[PDB]
Symmetry: D2
Subunit: 251 residues, 4 copies
Amino acid sequence: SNRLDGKVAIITGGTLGIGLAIATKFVEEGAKVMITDRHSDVGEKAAKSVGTPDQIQFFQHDSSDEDGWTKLFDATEKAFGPVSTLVNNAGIAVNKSVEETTTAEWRKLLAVNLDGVFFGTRLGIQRMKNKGLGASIINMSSIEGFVGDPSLGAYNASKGAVRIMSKSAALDCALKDYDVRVNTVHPGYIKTPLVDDLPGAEEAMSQRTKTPMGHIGEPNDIAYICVYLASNESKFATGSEFVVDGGYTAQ
Amino acid sequence: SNRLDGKVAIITGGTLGIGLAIATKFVEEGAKVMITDRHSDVGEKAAKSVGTPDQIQFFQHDSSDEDGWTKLFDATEKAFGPVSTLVNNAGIAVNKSVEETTTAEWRKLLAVNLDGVFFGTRLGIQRMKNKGLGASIINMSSIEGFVGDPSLGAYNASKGAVRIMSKSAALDCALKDYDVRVNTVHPGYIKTPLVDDLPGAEEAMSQRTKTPMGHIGEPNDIAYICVYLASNESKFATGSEFVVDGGYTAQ
Amino acid sequence: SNRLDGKVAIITGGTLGIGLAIATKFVEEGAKVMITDRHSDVGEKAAKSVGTPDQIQFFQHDSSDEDGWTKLFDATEKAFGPVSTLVNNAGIAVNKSVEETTTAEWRKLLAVNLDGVFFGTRLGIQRMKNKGLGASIINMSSIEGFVGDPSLGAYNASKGAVRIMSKSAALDCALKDYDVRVNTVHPGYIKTPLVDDLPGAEEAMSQRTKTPMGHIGEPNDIAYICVYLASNESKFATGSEFVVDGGYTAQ
Amino acid sequence: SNRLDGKVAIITGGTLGIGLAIATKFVEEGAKVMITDRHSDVGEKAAKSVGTPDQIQFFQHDSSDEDGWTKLFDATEKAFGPVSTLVNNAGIAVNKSVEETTTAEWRKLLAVNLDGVFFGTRLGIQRMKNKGLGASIINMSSIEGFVGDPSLGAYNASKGAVRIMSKSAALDCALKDYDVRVNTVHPGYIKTPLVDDLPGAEEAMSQRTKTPMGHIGEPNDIAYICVYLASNESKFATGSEFVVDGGYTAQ
Ligand SMILES: [Mg+2]
Ligand SMILES: [Mg+2]
């Protein structure tokens, strides 16, 4: 409890699965939270299921929407004060090999998975630097950021981009003493909407040959590592990659 | 000599520096070559300086231009026969931190560095698969694909994407027995015409803290590794990353 | 608090610096702790400074001493019950390049840094498996396990071995459902007793060219990540590497 | 041809499989070669099957034998002149998980796989530095140096050690302008005599879930990459890892 005391966090795609879990644990640790999503209907209900308006609120926003990012930060700051933590968790997947990926699919996935993370990270640095907030930007990546998958071409590209782009940002912040850390989280297959949208994915990735533990993880598995990265407990961690994949990339 | 016998290669951005060196060594090894770039002035002059039309030719093209990619393959195949080797070397850089990167700069760099490589790789697989050519796609990455640089935000992103996207393509090709290999080359600092126009550039790059050897490489350093990857000598190498950085990433 | 409720942990080299910090946080989180070292004086004094005998105790032991490992587990189990957590933190360093390393120095460093971790890990698996303890083995590595250092030849070797050997153990435990997780922690430069004994050491370590943040970390920086890995919060994390180096390996 | 003109190489375990292939390609490229083996039953037959005494010879030696290393360098230098290339290829494997590994098996495997490579690398640097030979030390590693295997505990450890230890050596040599490069080769599964003796070995290694290409490699696959690393073609490559695993580590 209170591991995130005084923190003010923004979690994109925090109305379901992983995002929702992170929001729940964040509030549980004393942080003010603002979750985002493109569906206001479910948004409001998700925030309320986690806590009261004084601890968590919802803000309709598409991570690929650049201008919206500024409005998202203004609303969050106006409601809870200066933002200190950002979790770029919103993302989509396309079940296509590089060979069979259409340019439309390619641009659509990168708009969210890459441009969106870029927009959030860029603005996050500008808004959270030099304010003694112990700012932390957590960029949700994936095991798909370390290894490839024959049917996740576009996805693999976006995740590999986020992985290294985050290091660049981490270095710049550290070298300029911005008081902003940047790190990536690389979830292995986790029981969530994105995976439960990928035909037979959970069954396939439960096989011992894919996930050594013989089962996939749960949203809280990612929420806990995010709490650590959001808290001052990891004040010396920046530009690092934290994997929680049940052994997937160990073999 | 003849380490690339019978090969037909396409080299984007092969009219200068690294690209030109790869083209030179490729022809030298018996491969038919087609180099590209948007500048026909230097392009046509470059091809002729390497060899005659029967061994090497120039094709004006912007790697970011999707439709052009099909015309590029048709022209090459029409001149030398079925393409068997593709080197995605064309790329640009922006000297900006993630924080100071404009969306215009971001999209412009990704259009060439990411979309361009995606377009080439996707079309390459479709055209070079299942033809007993011993097809090989070499995606030029960088050390900036392994580690970040505070002032190369966008660049880092595109190189990180190419790095993992290439593994995806490598896997799909192998698993489907397409007879197509996909690997990435990660050059460290290389002494090129552009580098010479920047006062103190090579100087800073040669600092022991950056490049342990105390000096940067030359175009041929990258050409030689590309020869190996283009030849049947590396028929068992796919989805791998080959670094030639003077020890940059060793420390 | 109580993030390690019911846990029984063994921490080698837990009488000073990092080890002592891990022990402090562990007890603080409700875990019973047994620290080890070769100096009884400092050891007993250390345990008592952290807590009472019912929560923490000391056991004189050399991690390189194979037989002692069994006595260490028996004493810990006899005092607090079945061991569920093992932190292989004891290690030594030699300031020598590979070229100038004597065979005696080489064997001496590997005896502790490699054999010692092997002994603890091997026995740990045998003793902590299949007991519903949520067992966790944390092998202390280093940034020197990812990158090399011209003056830490032997050290680099032992850290590189621990890094991959741990993945092997992690996989075997997961595939056999031993209820035992294995992960490595890779600290960057940390303000340890040794570092403070070397005039100007923290200075060289703090150079931006080495640690981007401009300063080294503190013992608690490593203790916090160890708490996460020891708790059920990371039940889906195994065979992974967690880095806390102030940006050292990011560049 | 003549890609290793003037080179004088030593290849440990060069009387069979990979080692023999490397020796064959080296001589074929103009290098003088000395192959070693712990045993002498095929040493002469092997060298003679590759070429005449003026191009290749055999020297009985156990890589774990420290003193023998000096005699090996003297014999080679006496026969062909100053050694310029060293390939630490001799190694052994134990099919045991970390949990089931005996201390005897542990020490035995490390003596050859780790100590042996250390002995060769250390002496190599001392003997080949500052002589304008374009010296190159190639330390044979494995995919088991990047990822773990539940039944190769000790093996994983030794390969992870060689992987990082090599980087240390590479840095020291580069920083001190020793004119010695150090790199590692990480073969995936390779069809070797030993493999043919294990029933169903190639079958299990050819599973798509293990090797995406659906088949393992051959000795020449490793010989070719070694030629590149031994020649001046890779004068700017040092401290790097070169993987040829048929896509094993790509997924
Ligand atoms: Mg580095
Ligand atoms: Mg893998």
